[PDB]
Homo-oligomer: A and B are copies of this chain.
Amino acid sequence: SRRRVVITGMGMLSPLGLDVPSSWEGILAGRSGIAPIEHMDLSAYSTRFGGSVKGFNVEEYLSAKEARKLDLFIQYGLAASFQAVRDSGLEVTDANRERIGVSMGSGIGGLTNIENNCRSLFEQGPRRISPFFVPGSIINMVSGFLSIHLGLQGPNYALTTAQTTGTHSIGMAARNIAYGEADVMVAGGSEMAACGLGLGGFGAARALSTRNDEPTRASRPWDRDRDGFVLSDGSGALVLEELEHARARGARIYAELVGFGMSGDAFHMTAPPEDGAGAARCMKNALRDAGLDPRQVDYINAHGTSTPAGDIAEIAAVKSVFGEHAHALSMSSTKSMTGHLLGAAGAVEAIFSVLALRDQVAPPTINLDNPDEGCDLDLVAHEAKPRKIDVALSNSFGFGGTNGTLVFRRFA
């Protein structure tokens, strides 16, 4: 029946690093990747900072000629994907290429490319729209280009569930493997929404921290003085592999993906219910999916976006699911350091949860200077905490009240 699914490769671009080891070092050091934005003039914007991928060189991966036609989210997705596949040691052959697929998603996709092509259309005319505009901007083309570059003939798709995308992409890819639709999936998310429409759109919703004077202090999940999320760019990709397939080739296994939960809040497009009932249903689904006692959960990588409503509803959900055990587990928001990578948030955070299992350390929630009312769990304030982690849970919640939970455990 269901096969087991393990993680054999990981790849990342984040505001903390151009790969997983560099990003993970920043996470354990409590380093902010948040800074005033340099690539554009934001003087008319109420938010002028975020998590950029600094010093990204697409020519470490792709020819300048190809990169020129690709939105940054595609470039970032491909880079993370290429890293994950190399990290896995997998050899794509005629014998296995039909069994290897990709599910790399995005919440927003090629908004920069769309904004630039809009400029061309309105300032000049449709004769100035790029012939590459559509395939260089649409969300499924991380999966599409990665399949073309590596010869992957397996299931090829893209999820778009806003800030849940990365979590759902990994969960559904794991289901593809579990049910025998594939033996290997490259799965994760990528995002680059840091153009005028992205910063302006989230700005127009009053969703973003306006702490321009101290950008590294802006993302402060569960802190009394939090005032909305920090917009960040990048990508995470994991190589997911059927367990017996991984054993057969002698793959290095990072961890086992044991649980995946999905749910809808069915409450509000942009706001969670105050009790976090949707997050609670999702986590319980994932825990049952994993065949676990909630007391087995040692570490939660929270969605923890630094929004007033979101942070407290997530505490509410965790308290509901874990009762007294909510006081024994460690929960942290790596968004304290990375900001909110939106569609990629769940992907980089799946990787941070797996590395919490490899290194037996809970990443910190930086900036948690004054926990808010009812935020009385172990939220790993300020500094990484070495502790026993056998089971780690990663939560993502998105616009539309779409929820995803991944459960990872150490593997023998």
Binding site for B on A (CB under 8 A): 44-45, 69, 97-98, 101-102, 105, 107-109, 111, 114-115, 117-119, 121-123, 125-127, 129-135, 137-141, 143-145, 147-148, 150-162, 164, 168, 172, 175, 179, 181, 196-207, 262-270, 278, 281, 398-403
Report chain B residues within 8 Å CB of A155: 262-264
Interface centre among A137, A138, A204 (most CB of B within 10 A): A138
Asked if A402 and B144 sit within 8 Å, CB to CB, the answer is yes
The chain B residue with its CB closest to the CB of A179 is B179
Given contacts A134-B202, A135-B270, A156-B263, 17 further A-B contacts (CB under 8 A): A44-B125, A45-B126, A69-B269, A107-B140, A111-B114, A114-B197, A117-B197, A140-B400, A144-B269, A144-B400, A145-B269, A147-B400, A153-B278, A154-B264, A155-B263, A158-B161, A175-B181
Q: How far is the CB of A262 from chain B (nearest CB, A)?
A: 4
Asked if B140 and A160 sit within 8 Å, CB to CB, the answer is yes
Q: How far is the CB of A135 from chain B (nearest CB, A)?
A: 5
Residue of B101, B134, B145, B400 touching A141 (CB-CB under 8 A) = B400
Residue of B179, B206, B402 touching A175 (CB-CB under 8 A) = B179
Interface centre among A45, A179, A262 (most CB of B within 10 A): A262
The chain B residue with its CB closest to the CB of A70 is B269
Q: How far is the CB of A276 from chain B (nearest CB, A)?
A: 13
Contact of A157 with B144 at beta-carbon distance under 8 Å, contacts A133-B204, A197-B121 already known: no
Asked if B148 and A262 sit within 8 Å, CB to CB, the answer is no
Residue of B147, B172, B203 touching A264 (CB-CB under 8 A) = B147
Contact of A147 with B200 at beta-carbon distance under 8 Å, contacts A158-B160, A159-B160, A400-B141 already known: no
Q: Give the CA-CA distance A134 to B111 in the complex, in Å.
A: 11
Asked if B98 and A204 sit within 8 Å, CB to CB, the answer is no
Q: Give the CA-CA distance A159 to B158 in the complex, in Å.
A: 6
Q: Give the CA-CA distance A119 to B125 in the complex, in Å.
A: 13
Residue of B151, B206, B262, B402 touching A266 (CB-CB under 8 A) = B151
Contact of A262 with B156 at beta-carbon distance under 8 Å, contacts A114-B114, A129-B204, A179-B179 already known: yes
Residue of B114, B154, B168 touching A263 (CB-CB under 8 A) = B154
The chain B residue with its CB closest to the CB of A269 is B135
Q: Give the CA-CA distance A157 to B404 in the complex, in Å.
A: 10
The chain B residue with its CB closest to the CB of A116 is B118
Residue of B69, B101, B199, B265 touching A126 (CB-CB under 8 A) = B199
Residue of B172, B198, B401 touching A148 (CB-CB under 8 A) = B401
Contact of A399 with B197 at beta-carbon distance under 8 Å, contacts A138-B108, A160-B139 already known: no
Interface centre among A114, A126, A135, A202 (most CB of B within 10 A): A126
Q: How far is the CB of A5 from chain B (nearest CB, A)?
A: 14
Contact of A140 with B156 at beta-carbon distance under 8 Å, contacts A121-B197, A148-B401 already known: no
Q: Give the CA-CA distance A141 to B402 in the complex, in Å.
A: 10
